[PDB]
Amino acid sequence: RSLIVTTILEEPYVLFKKSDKPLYGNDRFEGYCIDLLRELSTILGFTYEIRLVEDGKYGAQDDVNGQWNGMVRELIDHKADLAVAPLAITCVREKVIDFSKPFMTLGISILYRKGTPIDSADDLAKQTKIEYGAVEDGATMTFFKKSKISTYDKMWAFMSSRRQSVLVKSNEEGIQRVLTSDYAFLMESTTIEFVTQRNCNLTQIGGLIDSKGYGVGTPMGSPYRDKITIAICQLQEEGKLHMMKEKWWRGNGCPS
Amino acid sequence: NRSLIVTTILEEPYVLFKKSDKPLYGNDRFEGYCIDLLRELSTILGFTYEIRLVEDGKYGAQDDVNGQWNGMVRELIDHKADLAVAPLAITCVREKVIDFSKPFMTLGISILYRKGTPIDSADDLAKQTKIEYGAVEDGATMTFFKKSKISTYDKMWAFMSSRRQSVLVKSNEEGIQRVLTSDYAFLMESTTIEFVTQRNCNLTQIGGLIDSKGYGVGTPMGSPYRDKITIAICQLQEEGKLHMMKEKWWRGNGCPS
Numbered sequence A: 001r002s003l004i005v006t007t008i009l010e011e012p013y014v015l016f017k018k019s020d021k022p023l024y025g026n027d028r029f030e031g032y033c034i035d036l037l038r039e040l041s042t043i044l045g046f047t048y049e050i051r052l053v054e055d056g057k058y059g060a061q062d063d064v065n066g067q068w069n070g071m072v073r074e075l076i077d078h079k080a081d082l083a084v085a086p087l088a089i090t091c092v093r094e095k096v097i098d099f100s101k102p103f104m105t106l107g108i109s110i111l112y113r114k115g116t117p118i119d120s121a122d123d124l125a126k127q128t129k130i131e132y133g134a135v136e137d138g139a140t141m142t143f144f145k146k147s148k149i150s151t152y153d154k155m156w157a158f159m160s161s162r163r164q165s166v167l168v169k170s171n172e173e174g175i176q177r178v179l180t181s182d183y184a185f186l187m188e189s190t191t192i193e194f195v196t197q198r199n200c201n202l203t204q205i206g207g208l209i210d211s212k213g214y215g216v217g218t219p220m221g222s223p224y225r226d227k228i229t230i231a232i233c234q235l236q237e238e239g240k241l242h243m244m245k246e247k248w249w250r251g252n253g254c255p256s
Numbered sequence B: 001n002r003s004l005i006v007t008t009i010l011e012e013p014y015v016l017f018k019k020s021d022k023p024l025y026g027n028d029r030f031e032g033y034c035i036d037l038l039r040e041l042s043t044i045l046g047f048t049y050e051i052r053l054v055e056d057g058k059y060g061a062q063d064d065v066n067g068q069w070n071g072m073v074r075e076l077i078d079h080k081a082d083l084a085v086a087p088l089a090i091t092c093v094r095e096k097v098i099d100f101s102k103p104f105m106t107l108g109i110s111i112l113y114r115k116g117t118p119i120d121s122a123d124d125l126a127k128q129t130k131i132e133y134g135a136v137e138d139g140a141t142m143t144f145f146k147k148s149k150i151s152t153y154d155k156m157w158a159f160m161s162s163r164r165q166s167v168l169v170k171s172n173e174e175g176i177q178r179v180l181t182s183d184y185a186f187l188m189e190s191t192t193i194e195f196v197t198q199r200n201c202n203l204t205q206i207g208g209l210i211d212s213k214g215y216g217v218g219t220p221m222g223s224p225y226r227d228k229i230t231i232a233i234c235q236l237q238e239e240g241k242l243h244m245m246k247e248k249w250w251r252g253n254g255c256p257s
């Protein structure tokens, strides 16, 4: 039996492979998470079918009714066996789904343009001329919501009282807003690293604000979770996780 | 309920002896990021505890021949302690014999040497012989190099293993003192490197993180505290408390970097 693997389109983790002819099935995707998924299947010996989350969402809990959406809800309802995606392992998701050990470490940081007085979230928090936000219903947005730290709680009051105007639906939308307006985008440092190598005008501002991991998600209590953690340890041991990251982030396009 | 026995090891700034004129007793002897963490866990979960330094002074690694563990790891396996609240690296070989909470801090292995050196990576360090290098004996960093199949790290282990008696040292403080007085580069965890370099401007990290892992609270295999501790650390992490404690103990922030 074939495991259903739910994912989401996000460069350079998961993308449509470019070719002159129609591609079908798993063959039509490529990226870091497609390579990882492939290495996992050959270690653990399963077959799989990749499907993109119908929602287009990562997975947040809505306050009004306590229900999840996105990739998390797909695993909650057992419509997927695994989620191989840049899905952040967070405490609020660990209550409803299970994660393998992280296959990559990252943090929330700020994507903005080179050449400004802003050099930390602290500088953003204390003003309102430069708008900022994050992907709505992602892990970054939940960081700000739960923090009892002045700077981050103040950034959440700002974003919160301007939801319909400063929260974006995807990273690409946030990236487009940084490039076309006075807007700073809170997003994950791994993605920022990929993005600032293709746009020399963009830069990560300040350091990492938190620290987290991407792990493969599974429904709560499933037995593949421990198998997958052991496969990830082996790939880490062998340097393959590292090789996969140089391959997908290879692009000495801009100066660092 | 009885007090939990917590095993730990002296290591600035995680765990140290409070500075005082008069002598202190029990738990009152210690201070540090870890001791603060322990204190917070105890009130979140409601337990009393007694802190005991690991008898053999090691974090824990496996014997070459029989594969028996030593250090804090071995104390947990043997049930001599209920928890290990220390900068204990969560690693795959350790997870086979003890349980860890979710990590309260992430880090990686890096290199500590003097500023001014042309060495800029472990690959650089492996190809020369004027500069010696090593790690804390019987900890997660030594184990990393010992098990590595990556060419550069395997080359380094061949060196540290042959000069073992001299280059593997008993603690971070001993390795740091070797960096400051001899041509010796020290393989160690980035959090600790960050503590040191912020306070001594003659010292620097060389290269990036050599690998990546977290610190976690160790518990004996299958203990019920594991999930309760994970739950507490999540509370502390979400709200911003771990960050506030990191800032309190990594105080020194004063060098070009």
Ligand SMILES: N[C@@H](CCC(=O)O)C(=O)O
Residues within 6 Å of the ligand: A058, A059, A086, A087, A088, A089, A134, A135, A137, A138, A139, A140, A141, A186, A187, A188
């Ligand atoms: N990777 C995030 C989505 C994007 C973000 O929140 O920055 C998640 O797992 O929710």
Ligand SMILES: N[C@@H](CCC(=O)O)C(=O)O
Residues within 6 Å of the ligand: B059, B060, B087, B088, B089, B090, B135, B136, B138, B139, B140, B141, B142, B187, B188, B189
């Ligand atoms: N923190 C390490 C010890 C120090 C090191 O290996 O550099 C451990 O848990 O073993």
